[model samples]
Target: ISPIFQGGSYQLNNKSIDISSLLLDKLSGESQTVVMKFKADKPNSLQALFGLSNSKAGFKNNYFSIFMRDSGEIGVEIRDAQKGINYLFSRPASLWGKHKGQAVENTLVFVSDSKDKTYTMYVNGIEVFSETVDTFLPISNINGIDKATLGAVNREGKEHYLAKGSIDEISLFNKAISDQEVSTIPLSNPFQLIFQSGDSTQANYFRIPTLYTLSSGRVLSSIDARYGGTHDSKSKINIATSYSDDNGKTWSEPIFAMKFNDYEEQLVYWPRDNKLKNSQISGSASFIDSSIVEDKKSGKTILLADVMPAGIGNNNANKADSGFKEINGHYYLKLKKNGDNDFRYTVRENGVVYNETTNKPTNYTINDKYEVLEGGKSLTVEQYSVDFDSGSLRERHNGKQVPMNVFYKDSLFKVTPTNYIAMTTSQNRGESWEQFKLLPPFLGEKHNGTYLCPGQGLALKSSNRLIFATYTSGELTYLISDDSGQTWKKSSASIPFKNATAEAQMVELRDGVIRTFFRTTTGKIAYMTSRDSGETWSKVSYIDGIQQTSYGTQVSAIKYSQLIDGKEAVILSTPNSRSGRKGGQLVVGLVNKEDDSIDWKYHYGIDLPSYGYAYSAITELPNHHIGVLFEKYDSWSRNELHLSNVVQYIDLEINDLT
Candidate 1:
């Protein structure tokens, strides 16, 4: 009920305090003043210092709060009911301690006077910001939004951002207060620590945000909850989901959408260097890179991801084995780490370990926990698993202290997954999910190798079919489902251009023709048309005018509307980043059905100018608004792994994009 006392002040860890008594029915458009004295422990995370709320789902999640971005700036986001615009204004300022990411002590004040139609902010009695706003909206007082909180914001639920550090003081006035009166308030207290590593319920890092609204109007968000640093592979990662029923105001605690079966905790990582034997084990598994699609017809929500079996990654696995074999004209996952090695019995077939000398599938099998045995006696791993981990990515499984990617430039540091595509279904709007099943091993098993891309799939409402793309052995392929994904069929379409690698989506155009829009290796967004419902495709070509980084990145495209200026139109959401995954901008474009091409029209900068942004998911919201859910930071290369909810959701108006 009170702030935590610490270090001569109150410490806050993304927590809050209820100050309802001060509201007295003053709405957001009315005259009011708020004052606070606080500092962050570290400026590396987002902070919300005091705000008002009503607990109901609506357009702007917060009424108004003194906000701070990780990129070093302080500002406020307020809902102006009069003008019906979410007003945001911030300026660059160093609010943190000089020695590190921590914050410095400071006193601030915010005032909104409807009579003057002005919103003003001050720091240490100095006027730093002032703006004239609309007088039509009511203030927070009218809605009975009596509760005010410090340290964090109350958007959908509490603590979407928990302020990290000490709050020396906070003063709220129902009526407008003069800046000269604020300077007289004494700032002294035991600061509150609101959040800290390992203190919260989720992993310290989160990556790859994907958000979509169900046909039922519920919003579902998914992310890669990475446990071991933000490093990609050989690390534990789970596809986690959180949903907001009352809009984006409040969200549920993360429920893993997909996870490995090997751990007690959902998708928990096996300690690097296996603390048990200090040696690489034969079994490892993880579910990473989640994508989602909701079938409006059956109300079935499907989740897609890349499943890495134990001891396999670009940096860890024994790639020579190929993880597949051709038997009787069909492909099978390899059971051993090598092709021909006489060690009595080796390799597994159909989940059962078999002895090659006998040339028969052995009755000896593995249990749910991945134990290898023969009628009960345990067998050596070489007898059943293709699991093989080279001490490639640092000292993992070696019990030695070493820097990861120490030889990152060295060819040996390459990390890729012999990963498989995994999918699961939800009958409810993200309430519950069915058991996950791996896409048949045969899909990507051609040529003794398999490689898959990452991103969400698409549902062709016209055909009642679901579709996903793949980079199978560097060749583009498609996967389709007709019965709400009950069963899938791989397409015969052969995309063999050496420079053509794609992470694509297939959607039916208004004319009954299906088109695949994808990210291409040629520094361009490419597309292919299929008149026969995804069975085959014409030639893949670049979409003129739209350009991106040459190495290729994932993009989001959706069938947005059937009517736009008398023509059917689709929307594509992606960062127009030129150099790399930074300066994350949301470029929402309209796809012209006349030429089946896109016009890069409207755009919005979604993050700080320096914020690393990549990997996005887009869906149409109710009332003609577009929702873009994306990663707020680039977790791929950074040292301080940003995780556990790094994904942010922003709604854009359709007209605004035009």
Candidate 2:
């Protein structure tokens, strides 16, 4: 009989099954692999999947267990007092709360290799985690292993961390198994994880996925590698990029397209594990909410993101400062030295600092490394790194510990404590990127801060212009560029909405006409149009059929290449819930020939209504399949601390929606 069928299935609800007899011969190995198929009645809370312990000793002295936590993290623990071995490891939420009350089953595989002194875990056949240990002690090392239980840990005479679901089947191999053997396990909905939390980037969280397909058939994905937590800003966040040439099958390793060096990167959790309530790290500069566009005329891909000075976020940004000064009709990035109450210096040609009062050269300049230099010597500043376990920020300089933030009044250079837009260009299908450049305040003095709508921008086929949607101070705006992003101007016309509008996406209807669907405070998705390449807009209209919470979430929309149901089509992805960010759906709207208004035609649910879903981005693949990258957790709800909620990717056919 096969290893999978060796042990019979068992249903467990706060119960346990003794598996010591079944593992008589299996306990004689130094290396082993355990594979199990199981389902949980609830997706939240602590639950054990399997355990091994010595019957003659106390539970804590010698034991091993695999468990799941309320935050959706899967964990494993091993302890042996005699061997002086203690290990505890976990991966960020691979399982989600959205599967609550569903019969959805998952496969978990654990491999302990004594020869390599390593342990690895796989979920749904995808490698989720792997770590090396100083000492490897297998379960067989224990003297008395008469107490092995499934669905709970056997602690002396009591069962702890009981499971509340069913275990379909379990397989135990006395020796380590190959990756090919793990792939043979079946999964109902097999998908790939493009970015795993706590990977090489050392970022504890990731959010705001932006996906785009280049003209050369390569797909690019960018996201916020949030270090402290998932809060919008006042944290250390960088825009990370990855690309796939074989469509959505496999992705290359991610690289930082836009990053801030003010704070060193380290993993930090949420709430209980950290001192910060909302993952807000003070004095940390960040670049977030990316929007990508490919300029066909120049063959250059432009990536735009909202840049934050140290300790500034959307809510705390000083709206009065635009981070720029107008000098002879040209905008220059302004900086204030310590003890200066007013802005007295402006950056000039080649990043040279100029004293605005006397219009003469100053000793300070911004070097190519983006650091402040005085008298041609780089200004030395202490770098702060996070101690996540203690929830504190510490300083390091040349491998020695110190303390300070360059944003402090004592530092040499500082940008205005506000938000600004920054851009980076890639000429080779997102394979490499140029240094980031801060765009002049497009809104000028009107509003100092604005955020890109967190998705792809539109490239008009009618002309050489490229347009991207933006929002600031409760109004929708556009950033239009005609010279392949070399120059940008803000559109004068704003959408007329009685309520607030924010975080929108744009799609070209026909020729110069374009439409924008955006999040609004009216509890519904709203739209307006521009007939002349975003120079003007139409009156606002509501998509009442797809309702959402008054505190809306970001959405994605794109014009379909092929017509659906004999009509031009536009596809939109959003959460279709009025109470919370759940009920993920993809909606197809057919364009009316008379006025080019969208008519809602078909709706398809992306997942169960109870599953947490928020902030999705969609793009049309070269094969005509729609690729979606979305958050698999309720992003807005703060009832529970969300760390490393999985960012998932899936490709769909037109028929799947219609």
Number of the top lDDT candidate:
2
Give the per-residue lDDT of model 1 (tens digit) for 203-265. 555666677777777878777666544556555566778777665655776677776533222
Residue pairs of candidate 2 with colliding backbone atoms = 98-611
Error of 2 at 72 (Å): 7.3
TM-score of model number 1: 0.59
lDDT (Cα, 0-100) at 141 in candidate 1: 38
Q: In model 2, where do residues sit more than 4 Å from their true spots?
A: 1-34, 39-93, 96-105, 109-122, 125-168, 172-189, 198-200, 267-279, 367-369, 389-411, 492-501, 639-642
Any runs in candidate 1 off by more than 4 Å, and if so which? Answer: 1-201, 261-284, 295-299, 315-322, 329-333, 337-356, 359-363, 366-417, 442-453, 492-501, 544-547, 608-610, 636-645
CA shift of 592, model 2, Å: 1.8
lDDT of 2 by residue, 456-530 (tens): 988998789998888876467688999999988888546555435488999998999998999888789988888
